[PDB]
Amino acid sequence: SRKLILLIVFIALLLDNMLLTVVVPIIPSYLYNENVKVGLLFASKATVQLLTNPFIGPMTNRIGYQIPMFAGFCIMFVSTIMFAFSGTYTLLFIARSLQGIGSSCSSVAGMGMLASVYTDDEERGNAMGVALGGLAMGVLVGPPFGSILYEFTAPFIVLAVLVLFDGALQLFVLLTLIRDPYILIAAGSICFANMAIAMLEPALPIWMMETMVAFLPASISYLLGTNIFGPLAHKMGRWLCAFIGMIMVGISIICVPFARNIYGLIAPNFGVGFAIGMVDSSMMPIMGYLVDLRHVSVYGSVYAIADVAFCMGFAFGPSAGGAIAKSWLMTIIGVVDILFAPLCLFLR
């Protein structure tokens, strides 16, 4: 009976990630400082998520999480269809903002409900690793499915008919500020670990073009690592797992950029994806453990902070891409990550 909530969270996360990733190959200018607006097109979702999550945080504790879940389903259902008839780019920006706030609400409600239903550490870790694996599956299957169905209304009909079953199942089933660094360390670690891939995402096509599917190895590694290295981390402490993951991602990021040939350039992305997935999966339940240590037993605000840290990198990663490219390696994030790694060496 308890696995129904996990299934609902899985479906919601997969749906949100699939909707997010389908926008990558198709652009409003493609279908017909322009690149600045193109970047803003996908930056708007992250910015509105960051702006909206903290305000909708405490409402979960004030009222509940099932009603926010139903509202997230409703807003997703009313927002997805609008992509079918798009007139102007500003309408696309508005649709992106609505989808972003809906995804934020759905994710926070799902994480809160999943944290509240299970009070056991290893089961909680397994459930959240399953959620992360579902996110990985969605981000992996988005682009190819969208690309193949673009040729064979048509681009989004499958999603429009898929949301219906999830909505029907969901319908049928029915202190703000912290000065403690013990959560801030995890927030910063996950923020930088996500900022690494956020910065790596747009820079690679520049090298590909100047040297004459890029994120597929990374997604494959993420999916094949998260679910397989999640549960085993409970056997021992979180020190070694997080430290090794941070060291691995730092080494991979430092070694990836320079490449004499491009055929083997995709191989380091496997290491990057494995490292980011391992770090995220290992670090996710530590916040819940700290909440259990804390007097407050409501996980809504801490998971809201976690999501804010998750989306901080997506907010303005590619904002300074051209300036960084014009600007000794162009990427130095690995050094920052490795020097910040020993901060989380000691844990309760």
Numbering used by the authors: 18 to 49, 125 to 244, 248 to 269, 285 to 322, 331 to 445, 450 to 470
Provide text from the study.
Vesicular monoamine transporter 2 (VMAT2) is responsible for H+-dependent uptake of monoamine neurotransmitters, e.g. dopamine (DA) and serotonin (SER), from the cytoplasm to presynaptic vesicles in monoaminergic neurons. Vesicular monoamine transporter 2 (VMAT2) belongs to the major facilitator superfamily (MFS), and mediates cytoplasmic monoamine packaging into presynaptic vesicles. Substrates bind to MFS transporters between N-domain and C-domain, and are transported by a rocker-switch alternating access mechanism. In this work, we report two cryo-EM structures of VMAT2, with VMAT2 from Xenopus laevis adopting a canonical MFS fold and an engineered VMAT2 from Ovis aries adopting a non-canonical fold.
Eventually, the structure of XlVMAT2WT was determined at 4.0 Å resolution after extensive data collection and processing. A total of 348 out of 514 residues were traced in the XlVMAT2WT structure, including all 12 TM helices and several connecting loops. Intriguingly, comparison to the hMCT2 structure revealed that the XlVMAT2WT structure adopts a canonical MFS fold. Unlike OaVMAT2TM8/9-BRIL, N- and C-domains of XlVMAT2WT are structurally similar, and could be superimposed with a Cα RMSD of 2.5 Å. The XlVMAT2WT structure was solved in an apo, lumen-facing open conformation with a large, deep cavity. Serotonin was placed in a pocket between TM5, TM7, TM8, TM10 and TM11 near the center of XlVMAT2WT. Meanwhile, the hydroxyl group of serotonin forms a hydrogen bond with the side chain of E311 (TM7), and its amine group interacts with side chains of N304 (TM7) and D398 (TM10) via a hydrogen bond and a salt bridge, respectively. Meanwhile, purified XlVMAT2WT showed reasonable binding affinities for substrates dopamine (Kd = 1.13 ± 0.52 μM) and serotonin (Kd = 0.43 ± 0.22 μM), and for the inhibitor reserpine (Kd = 17.0 ± 8.8 nM). The non-canonical structure of OaVMAT2TM8/9-BRIL forms a dimer, whereas the canonical structure of XlVMAT2WT is a monomer.
